[PDB]
Amino acid sequence: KTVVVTTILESPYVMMKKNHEMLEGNERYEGYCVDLAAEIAKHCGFKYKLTIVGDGKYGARDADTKIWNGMVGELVYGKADIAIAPLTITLVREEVIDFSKPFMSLGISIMIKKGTPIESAEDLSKQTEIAYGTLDSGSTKEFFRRSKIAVFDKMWTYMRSAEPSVFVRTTAEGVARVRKSKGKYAYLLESTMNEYIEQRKPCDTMKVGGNLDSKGYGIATPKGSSLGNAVNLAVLKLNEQGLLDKLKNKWWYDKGEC
């Protein structure tokens, strides 16, 4: 009956309301994906329950274990009926779960502490003084591990062997590392997140260079799910009506702090 929605605590997509302690169920959260979930549910005609993914990961398949973790895993193993979050549409994932057409378009980008002598990925690859890494168990790390183009291959070679680890468990951890490393750490993350943080106090980070690739986020459902068709149509309908653009302006710029 009630659709179990798996999501992730990633500002400004999903965040705890300041007074969540005195609220119940779905009312405890706020954000872009919370607003989107309510709309998808309205248009598809179903009641739902928002739940935060247990391991706090987006989703990747363990090499030897072969088990999927994160939100992808919750769907693969039947723990959730749908995932509404900044989950990237990728080949390896579409092989095991279904994705609606994208609700947000983005690409991998570079986040630096203001003043850092870095203007592009090629700049990062040709130097060694400034360390750089990505989020764990996600599409960004896989992008570099599989890239066959010179620059990115060079970047992966370095990142995979760097000590201490240059990878982080959460976006917040990567942003904090940039902010505290005095320009000696650069973070590779999706443009959407980079742009968001660039508008948050202390306004000490910035997105540099063009995006490394072009892709998008999609609402995911277990392969063969009966919700797939309607959800996809809802996303297209909502994008065409301007809701998605309205929602990004609401959570990114209307609330900018810089």
Instruction: Output the known binding site.
Output: 86, 88, 93, 139-140, 190
Q: Provide, rounded to whole angstroms, the least separation between the CB of residue 233 and its own copies.
A: 6
When asked if residue 165 is in the footprint of its own copies (CB under 8 A), the reply is no
Binding residues for L-glutamate: 86, 88, 93, 139-140, 190
**How near is the Cβ of 239 to its own copies at its closest, in Å?**
7
Strands (E), 180-222: 185-190, 205-208, 215-217, 220-222
User: Applying CB under 8 A, does 94 fall inside the site for its own copies?
Assistant: yes
254 contributes a contact to its own copies by CB under 8 A: no
Q: What's the CA gap between 147 and 142, in Å, rounded?
A: 8
The reply to whether 245 sits near Zn ion by the rule CB under 5 A is: no
Of the residues 18, 47, 66, 148, which one makes contact with its own copies according to CB under 8 A: 148
Distance CA 218, CA 232 (A): 9
Residue of 21, 64, 240, 254 interacting with Zn ion (CB under 5 A): 64
CA distances from 105 to 86, 127, 153, 192, 217 (A): 10, 30, 24, 8, 7
Report the partner that residue 64 touches, choosing among its own copies, Zn ion, none (CB closer than 5 to 8 A by kind): Zn ion
37: which residues sit within 8 A by CB, 6+ positions away?
5, 7, 26, 48, 50, 84
Identify the burial level of 13 via C-beta atoms within 10 angstroms of its C-beta, where 0-12 means exposed, 13-18 middle and 19 or more buried: buried
Binding site for its own copies (CB under 8 A): 89-91, 94-95, 99, 101-102, 105, 143, 146-149, 213-216, 218, 232-233, 236-237, 239-242, 244-245
